[PDB]
């Protein structure tokens, strides 16, 4: 019964927005990645630094599970060295990233008629994010040389933005649930095997 809670992340009910992604650290348990492949519901299942076929035979110090929701057009930006609104302003992975990137379509769950305004994404930011940096600031972005004084208007836009997922949208704009597993290896003993 010492199994790592995989269902608590993938089979979760709510998924955070990409600008305020949710991270759950997993340690001291048995990680069975074989049941992950036995689902076939994932559109993207790519790993970096390790081979996904040779998984379930490794050990790591800590395992961080970052879960959020973006659209299919932006799933390509969940990779080291990528650019775009998601990779620069919302969730940036390091170049020396050693983990796996899992994603699957959730149109029947994260999309309602008229627009699912529950999910947001940062659109404007004065600079890009660092690896594993989260920016939840709602400061009014100054688009031009005109100041804003915390009030929206001309050249002053709200930093966040909603997706408005609809079931009738294109496949690129439909919502996709992403779970980025980070495998940390330090000089400390490992706690996640199995």
């Amino acid at each position, epitope marked *: 019964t010492n199994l790592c809670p995989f269902g608590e992340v993938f089979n979760a009910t709510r998924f955070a927005s990409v600008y305020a992604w949710n991270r759950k650290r997993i340690s001291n348990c048995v990680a069975d990645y074989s049941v992950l492949y036995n689902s076939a519901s994932f559109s993207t299942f790519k790993c970096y630094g390790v081979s996904p076929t040779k998984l379930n035979d490794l050990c790591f110090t800590n395992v961080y599970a970052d879960s959020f929701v973006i659209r299919g057009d932006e799933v390509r930006q969940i990779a080291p060295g990528q650019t775009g609104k998601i990779a620069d302003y919302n969730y940036k992975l390091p170049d020396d990233f050693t983990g796996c990137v899992i994603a699957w379509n959730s149109n029947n769950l994260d999309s309602k008629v008229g627009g699912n*305004y529950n999910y947001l994404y940062r659109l404007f930011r004065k600079s890009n994010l660092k690896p594993f940096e989260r920016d*939840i600031s709602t400061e009014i972005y100054q688009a031009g040389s005109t100041p804003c004084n915390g009030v929206e208007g001309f050249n002053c836009y709200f930093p966040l933005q*909603s997706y408005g997922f609809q079931p009738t949208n294109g496949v690129g704009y439909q919502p996709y649930r992403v779970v980025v597993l980070s495998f940390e290896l330090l000089h400390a003993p490992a706690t996640v095997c199995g």
Partner: nanobody
Amino acid sequence: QVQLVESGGGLVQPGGSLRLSCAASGFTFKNADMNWYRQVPGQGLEWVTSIYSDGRTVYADSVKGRFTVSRDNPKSTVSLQMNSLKPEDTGVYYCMAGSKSGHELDHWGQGTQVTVSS
């Protein structure tokens, strides 16, 4: 210039009632979706409720039966009747209008602080 003017924050004891208002100017209000979000200092925005142009109202399960959204289309006003408040409802509330026009952006309000504690 699209503007959203928020109003109706303030301090309230656990169990009080509030009525936040959103003043919309610069677009067709009768054909726009209006949404409410609250942000506790330290966390991201949480979707509170929404009311579409169809008049359909959708509420989060955390405020089910306690909040209510109004839509005064001639006045172009979004009213959020916040009733039976709890300390967990403390935070800055935002009303935003968005979408329907493609190359547009969701316009947001300036926010109103709401505090509930004793």
